[PDB]
Design an enzyme around this catalytic site. Structure first.
Site: not given
Ligand SMILES: *[C@@H]1O[C@H](CO)[C@@H](O[C@@H]2O[C@H](CO)[C@@H](O[C@@H]3O[C@H](CO)[C@@H](O)[C@H](O)[C@@H]3O)[C@H](O)[C@H]2NC(C)=O)[C@H](O)[C@H]1NC(C)=O
Ligand SMILES: *[C@@H]1O[C@H](CO)[C@@H](O[C@@H]2O[C@H](CO)[C@@H](O[C@@H]3O[C@H](CO)[C@@H](O)[C@H](O)[C@@H]3O)[C@H](O)[C@H]2NC(C)=O)[C@H](O)[C@H]1NC(C)=O
Ligand SMILES: *[C@@H]1O[C@H](CO)[C@@H](O)[C@H](O)[C@H]1NC(C)=O
Ligand SMILES: *[C@@H]1O[C@H](CO)[C@@H](O)[C@H](O)[C@H]1NC(C)=O
Ligand SMILES: *[C@@H]1O[C@H](CO)[C@@H](O)[C@H](O)[C@H]1NC(C)=O
Ligand SMILES: *[C@@H]1O[C@H](CO)[C@@H](O)[C@H](O)[C@H]1NC(C)=O
Ligand SMILES: *[C@@H]1O[C@H](CO)[C@@H](O)[C@H](O)[C@H]1NC(C)=O
Lengths: 113, 253, 253, 113
Positions: C1-2, C18, C178, C191
């Site tokens: 996730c971001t 996200n 993460n 990411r």
């Protein structure tokens, strides 16, 4: 654990091996020469550690072949250290007749663990 | 190793530490000692680093080791270094160093640079907190005033925690051994808890060179790995180091 | 996730994230999707939590999951939660819980407790930083004023780092994926670096719901695990969530 | 990786599956009733996940015997959760006909990873 110790200072008794001698390091000297005086007195004892390190290494791997690599390959592999450490360690290696790779390994033992 | 920064009721600082090291080469079954630990004792020296016949800093070191693990700058600050273990910290830093990334400092050299060229407790604190290092470590720093004590738990590129004295809260000392304060110790020894028990029994009013040495002489705070004990007072300028023994019965570490 | 907290030239805050999750059950080789990810989409819902016919907070959650992973308190702050991995963090906390130590909070409940009962950015910040938790985590918090954005990298019992916006220094956003900011990512997915590249190309002047959604639609920031995208504006009070798809060609995670 | 995407908002196109529906949770209700309305609408989909979890669990160990343990032993093992979560999850279990242990496992999946 144990009950907190009382009346142990000034140091005496079986837990006090002895006092620590004082030495003066003159930073005005070039780095290559700063440790000359102290290393003259302590070169023999430091060699005792090296010999003791060789014997234990001998079990897993022949100590000779390991130290050829340490002395010959490690200095170039790690490159130069910032001053005065490179010259300070170079000086210690010359005075003690201990190869530079072993002097380096001694000075980076923390990173090595 | 054990590092303690203490503050008496009068705000006076005492910095004591036990240097434990030497399991690498094994155990002497003949006299119940660690091989390296006994060999490091006759190599231990007190060092008076002078510039123009003026003392810059004094240290306790092993002859041949140019980095500084125990030292102080008279009237300014005192610094001790404790080993910190990580899954794969030490070697990732060396690896990037070999491949040419040299923007990190070796731990022994950083403490040497601070003791040699730092001029205040804040400058050293700031450098010890921010400087990139090739391996994790604990930095225990004491100042020349009351309240100037902290433990810096370091990552290679980050400062995970800075634990400071708080006379308000009742924190007249900070203790650091070899495990992160908010976690748990690896073994039974747990030298931190007995140190606090003995520091607590001494009470803030009575902390001194004499009672600090009492804490560092209690097992397991004193143990077979203990090469020497150091007592430091920055404002007074007194710096003393004593080789130690832990005769049987004692504990390994 | 971001999770991204951004600040435009006007000091206006935008919080976007996200939600990537769902490798546990494997991969659908028939249409190139993650089993759970596709199953989590029809379960995703927007939730309007009201007390006395007035909205307290809004959230994005999975039906049946009572903790909050994405939400905000209109006019006050916005909070998103990112997963943090450790050697053995999650299970030691559960173990102490079963054996009777219950003074730590579950991660989903803590963020729910904050969104429900916290009344300020600092109150949430202070609680998110200090409360004992059973597992490590990242907390990304945004406020109702300029400069109020931070990433809290948490250990079970300690706050390892609080990374805050500094628009003066040139930090007009904070990004969290993460992996610890001062470390390196586990894979190529990385990411974080492309997220910063796209945040950089947009520039502070142009950050908006449109440009933020642009960042979160660029691969690998958008990937097969992306269940939904959320865009938040605290002062405006707007909170919208969109289900996402990453059709071939794309990346797994 | 990829060039930063332009003109993607408002959402449309192949990367936008659809909008997310809104539901209101009234905290004035007791915790046991808060999720009743929403869980009635979404109970079938949540069962799809559980069924898919049983199939995957079956590989390592038969899913039935595993789920007996989760449903029968896990609630007592973890003990009670602080309010409103214990009652909120108990209500979700009753409305969906999903055992409490599975609802709990879903709600602590982060700690479980
Ligand atoms: C336990 O036994 C070991 C040896 O079996 C002891 O280690 C020895 O310690 C002494 C100093 O305490 C070392 O003596 C040194 O010799 C060098 C030259 O060899 C000299 O330059 C030094 O000034 C010093 O005299 C000796 O080398 C060392 N031996 C080994 C193999 O390390 C240890 O001290 C004993 N410990 C106890 C508590 O009895
Ligand atoms: C790729 O293929 C899988 C199946 O092979 C798709 O999974 C299915 O996705 C749909 C909608 O995302 C799910 O529909 C739901 O069905 C349940 C009853 O089964 C109903 O109660 C819900 O309201 C909803 O209509 C379906 O459950 C789900 N199937 C499984 C086994 O998870 C997936 O969506 C496909 N993805 C793409 C991008 O084509
Ligand atoms: C201390 O003095 C200067 C830096 O200001 C430099 O020449 C010297 O190498 C420094 N010493 C160390 C150990 O960094
Ligand atoms: C303490 O450190 C400060 C640093 O500014 C210095 O000015 C002062 O001389 C030092 N000594 C004492 C006794 O405060
Ligand atoms: C919020 O309000 C009080 C605690 O101050 C309590 O009645 C209620 O349960 C709290 N909610 C949560 C989720 O902790
Ligand atoms: C912003 O939040 C603070 C608390 O951090 C609160 O006191 C203040 O009223 C809020 N102001 C606005 C305009 O939302
Ligand atoms: C983003 O821009 C900043 C300039 O402030 C730069 O330091 C950083 O390296 C850039 N990052 C990327 C991924 O382009």
């Amino acid at each position: 654990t144990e009950d907190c110790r009382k009346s142990t200072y000034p140091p005496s008794g079986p837990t006090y091996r002895g006092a620590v001698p004082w030495y003066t390091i003159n930073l005005d000297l070039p780095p290559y020469k700063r440790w000359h005086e102290l290393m003259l007195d302590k070169a023999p004892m430091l060699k005792v550690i090296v010999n003791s390190l060789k014997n234990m290494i001998n079990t897993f791997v022949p100590s000779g072949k390991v130290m050829q690599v340490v002395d010959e390959k490690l200095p170039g592999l790690l490159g130069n250290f910032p001053g005065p450490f490179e010259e300070e360690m170079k000086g210690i290696a010359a005075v003690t007749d201990i190869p530079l790779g072993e002097i380096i390994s001694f000075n980076i033992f923390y990173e090595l663990f | 190793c054990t590092s303690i920064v203490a503050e008496d009721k009068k705000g006076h600082l005492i910095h004591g530490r036990n240097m434990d090291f030497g399991v690498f080469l094994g155990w002497n079954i003949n006299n119940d000692t660690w091989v390296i630990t006994e060999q490091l004792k006759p190599l231990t020296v007190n060092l008076d680093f002078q510039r123009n016949n003026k003392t810059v800093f004094k240290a306790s070191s092993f002859a041949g080791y140019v980095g500084m693990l125990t030292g102080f700058k008279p009237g300014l600050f005192s610094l001790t270094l404790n080993e910190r273990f990580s899954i794969n910290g030490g070697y990732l830093g060396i690896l990037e160093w070999i491949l040419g990334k040299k923007d990190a400092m070796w731990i022994g050299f950083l403490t040497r640079t601070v003791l040699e060229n730092s001029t205040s407790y804040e400058e050293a604190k700031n450098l010890l907190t921010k400087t990139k290092i090739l391996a994790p470590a604990y930095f225990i720093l004491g100042g020349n005033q009351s309240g100037e004590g902290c433990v810096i738990t370091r990552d290679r590129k980050e400062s995970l925690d800075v634990y400071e004295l708080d006379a308000k809260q009742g924190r007249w000392y900070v203790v650091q051994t070899n495990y992160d304060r908010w976690k748990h110790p690896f073994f039974l020894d747990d030298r931190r808890t007995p140190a606090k028990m003995c520091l607590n029994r001494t009470s803030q009013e009575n902390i001194s060179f004499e009672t600090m040495y009492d804490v560092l002489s209690t097992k397991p705070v004193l143990n077979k790995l203990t090469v020497y004990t150091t007592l430091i007072d920055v404002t007074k300028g007194q710096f003393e180091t004593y080789l130690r023994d832990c005769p049987d019965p004692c504990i390994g570490w």
